[PDB]
Design an enzyme around this catalytic site. Structure first.
Site, PDB file in Angstrom:
ATOM      1  N   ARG A 115      11.423 -14.351   8.106  1.00  0.00           N
ATOM      2  CA  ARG A 115      10.802 -15.088   9.145  1.00  0.00           C
ATOM      3  C   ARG A 115       9.853 -14.131   9.799  1.00  0.00           C
ATOM      4  NH1 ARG A 115      15.912 -16.103  10.648  1.00  0.00           N
ATOM      5  NH2 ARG A 115      15.741 -16.792  12.843  1.00  0.00           N
ATOM      6  N   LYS A 180      24.083  -9.465  12.356  1.00  0.00           N
ATOM      7  CA  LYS A 180      23.523 -10.450  11.454  1.00  0.00           C
ATOM      8  C   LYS A 180      23.991 -10.161  10.035  1.00  0.00           C
ATOM      9  CE  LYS A 180      18.775 -11.700   9.800  1.00  0.00           C
ATOM     10  NZ  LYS A 180      17.492 -12.175  10.340  1.00  0.00           N
ATOM     11  N   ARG A 305      22.209 -12.092  25.950  1.00  0.00           N
ATOM     12  CA  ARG A 305      21.965 -11.509  27.294  1.00  0.00           C
ATOM     13  C   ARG A 305      23.200 -10.800  27.841  1.00  0.00           C
ATOM     14  NH1 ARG A 305      21.435 -13.532  33.993  1.00  0.00           N
ATOM     15  NH2 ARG A 305      21.167 -11.365  34.630  1.00  0.00           N
TER      16      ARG A 305
HETATM   17  O1  LIG Z   1      16.172 -13.196   8.305  1.00  0.00           O
HETATM   18  C1  LIG Z   1      15.196 -13.867   7.889  1.00  0.00           C
HETATM   19  O2  LIG Z   1      14.073 -13.794   8.407  1.00  0.00           O
HETATM   20  C2  LIG Z   1      15.460 -14.831   6.773  1.00  0.00           C
HETATM   21  C3  LIG Z   1      15.594 -14.064   5.467  1.00  0.00           C
HETATM   22  C4  LIG Z   1      15.675 -14.980   4.243  1.00  0.00           C
HETATM   23  C5  LIG Z   1      15.688 -14.185   2.919  1.00  0.00           C
HETATM   24  C6  LIG Z   1      16.108 -14.975   1.722  1.00  0.00           C
HETATM   25  S1  LIG Z   1      16.415 -14.005   0.209  1.00  0.00           S
HETATM   26  C7  LIG Z   1      16.265 -15.477  -0.837  1.00  0.00           C
HETATM   27  C8  LIG Z   1      15.174 -16.324  -0.210  1.00  0.00           C
HETATM   28  N1  LIG Z   1      13.893 -15.958  -0.762  1.00  0.00           N
HETATM   29  C9  LIG Z   1      13.228 -15.147   0.069  1.00  0.00           C
HETATM   30  O3  LIG Z   1      12.304 -14.393  -0.247  1.00  0.00           O
HETATM   31  N2  LIG Z   1      13.756 -15.237   1.317  1.00  0.00           N
HETATM   32  C10 LIG Z   1      15.020 -15.942   1.302  1.00  0.00           C
END
Ligand SMILES: O=C(O)CCCC[C@@H]1SC[C@@H]2NC(=O)N[C@@H]21
Length: 305
Positions: A115, A180, A305
């Protein structure tokens, strides 16, 4: 990109292989074998060399098994890639040869992405890199709970395979010991008056911050099972979703929400909302209460928070 895949395929045991046994099997020189070795070192693969003798893996990896995976599943269309740019791309790049629930897993991703333009990090066979295609009729309108749904499901699958304490973060990640554990990237294409075409990516930290892996919490799950359980229950839920929306979740969500009834921080862009979580609303909306005052919000990121 073969050989590598063969090599790797044999070193997988974690044992010694002399470049000697390897080259004959492979029907090639020790010489050739050392080049492939590099390629490997490159996929996050930690190869231990002993100059003119042979190779070893510090650690033994368990590779994906189409057949194993295929095996179960029930009626399943899965692509098992070993090497690729990214599981999301692969599908985005092919939305129209696709159908609802189509999936794919790779052993390692060259351009794993998260993201907000973040790099994902996808070393060969250490974790779970997966994506699923889904099409929605009403169109662009949905998704929101689609993702809640996804996190929800994943939490369940984990919870049932071992990792009994996995929780969900509204709207896109799995948590454990408040770090996470998994990352979720949902991507949509749409039209006005036309199905939304969804590609859903999930990244799960298996092998050994603020982030956590299953192995550190001492959970050691099967990859192939994991895999297969996931796709099956998502197919199952995306339908159910397709048919009802959040209605069926909600209570599910509440019991898995990691931050409910806690102090947090919500932000769309740079704008900071501060207060307490009262969950999600019938529209996958976050509930935020600020001074006995609960309100809905469909955007931003949630930190604590
Ligand atoms: O934390 C995040 O921002 C979301 C990460 C999502 C990664 C997974 S790995 C399989 C699929 N293909 C990608 O390249 N991204 C998702």
């Amino acid at each position: 990109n073969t050989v590598p895949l063969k090599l790797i395929a044999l070193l997988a045991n974690g044992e010694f292989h002399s470049g000697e046994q390897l080259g004959e099997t492979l029907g090639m020189s020790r010489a050739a074998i050392n080049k492939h070795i590099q390629t490997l070192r490159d996929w996050g693969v930690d190869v231990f060399t002993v100059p003119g003798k042979g190779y070893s893996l510090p650690e033994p990896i368990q590779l994906l098994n189409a057949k194993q995976i295929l095996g179960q599943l029930d009626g399943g269309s899965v692509a098992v890639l070993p090497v690729i740019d990214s599981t999301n791309q692969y599908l985005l790049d092919r939305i129209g040869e696709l159908k609802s629930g189509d999936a794919c897993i790779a052993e390692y991703q060259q351009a794993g992405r998260g993201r907000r333009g973040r790099k994902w990090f996808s070393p060969f066979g250490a974790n779970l890199y997966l994506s699923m295609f889904w099409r929605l009729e009403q169109g662009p309108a949905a998704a929101i709970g689609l993702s809640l749904v996804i996190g929800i499901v994943m939490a369940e699958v984990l919870r049932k395979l071992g990792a009994d304490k996995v929780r969900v973060k509204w709207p896109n990640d799995l948590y454990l010991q408040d770090r996470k554990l998994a990352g979720i990237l949902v991507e949509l294409t749409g039209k006005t008056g036309d199905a939304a075409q969804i590609v859903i990516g999930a990244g799960i930290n298996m092998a050994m911050q603020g982030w956590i892996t299953l192995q550190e919490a001492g959970i050691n799950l099967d990859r192939n099972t994991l895999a297969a359980m996931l796709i099956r229950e998502l197919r199952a839920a995306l339908e159910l979703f397709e048919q009802e929306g959040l209605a069926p979740y909600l209570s599910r969500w509440e019991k898995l929400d990691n931050f409910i009834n806690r102090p947090v921080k919500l932000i769309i862009g740079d704008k900071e909302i501060f207060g307490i979580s009262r969950g999600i609303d019938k529209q996958g909306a976050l509930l935020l209460e600020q001074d006995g005052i609960i309100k809905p919000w469909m955007g931003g990121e949630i930190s604590l928070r």
